[PDB]
Amino acid sequence: RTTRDDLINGNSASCADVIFIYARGSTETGNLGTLGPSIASNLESAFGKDGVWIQGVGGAYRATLGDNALPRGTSSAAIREMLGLFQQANTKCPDATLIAGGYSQGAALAAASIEDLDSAIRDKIAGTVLFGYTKNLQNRGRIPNYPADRTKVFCKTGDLVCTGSLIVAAPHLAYGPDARGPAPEFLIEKVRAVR
């Protein structure tokens, strides 16, 4: 559904080979929102249901509208939450390949948490997909400290949050097809290339 806690509910003896951590958009449902379940179903078709753990960023990430106006596009508490989930994946499942994603405020959250990681865990994140990336212009289409070749930004023409605004126009609401197809396809290609 819109809530997946496979990492938090898993343990070191049940580790999947692939762990996907995803941050939803502002005021979205569960911990996966509108796009996360689509990405998860496509990953599960490729790796098998037991080949991948799906984990949304819940806990202290409350995905409030107002926190988009904070300097990094989200709150420091949300960033600590997603950093703790990357650390939990690295500690519980040292051999797992990580992949990540986020929509809107969740894209700003994924970018800030990846920036703030140490290199040992960051280098385990084989690919990251961002949709409606609210810091696209500000970060010049990149995630700080993370390679461009591991990054795939879905920023539709006319999605004004990708050009420095916070206005949500119809292209911001149109990432469903990307979440069902090219975004999980990119993550799967990066995981296959490493494993």
Side-chain angles (χ1 to χ4, degrees), residues 130-149:
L130 302 180
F131 310 83
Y133 182 27
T134 53
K135 296 306 189 182
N136 188 60
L137 174 63
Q138 301 88 334
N139 289 335
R140 300 165 10 225
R142 302 277 305 278
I143 296 166
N145 291 334
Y146 192 60
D149 59 27

Side-chain angles (χ1 to χ4, degrees), residues 13 16 39-40 48 61 66 77 83 94 96 103 116 152 154 159 171-172 174 190 194:
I39 309 170
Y61 175 44
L83 281 169
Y103 173 39
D116 289 357
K152 185 164 198 91
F154 297 92
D159 182 354
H172 190 69
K190 296 301 182 177
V194 319

Side-chain angles (χ1 to χ4, degrees), residues 25-28 34 64-66 68 103-105 131-134 156-175:
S26 300
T27 328
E28 290 202 319
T34 53
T64 81
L65 235 21
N68 292 277
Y103 173 39
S104 198
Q105 179 176 356
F131 310 83
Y133 182 27
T134 53
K156 273 183 187 306
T157 302
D159 182 354
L160 306 179
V161 314
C162 295
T163 55
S165 189
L166 291 173
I167 294 166
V168 170
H172 190 69
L173 271 11
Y175 291 114

Side-chain angles (χ1 to χ4, degrees), residues 32-53:
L32 292 185
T34 53
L35 304 181
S38 290
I39 309 170
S41 291
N42 188 299
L43 295 175
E44 290 162 8
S45 177
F47 299 128
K49 180 61 166 197
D50 260 75
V52 60
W53 277 355

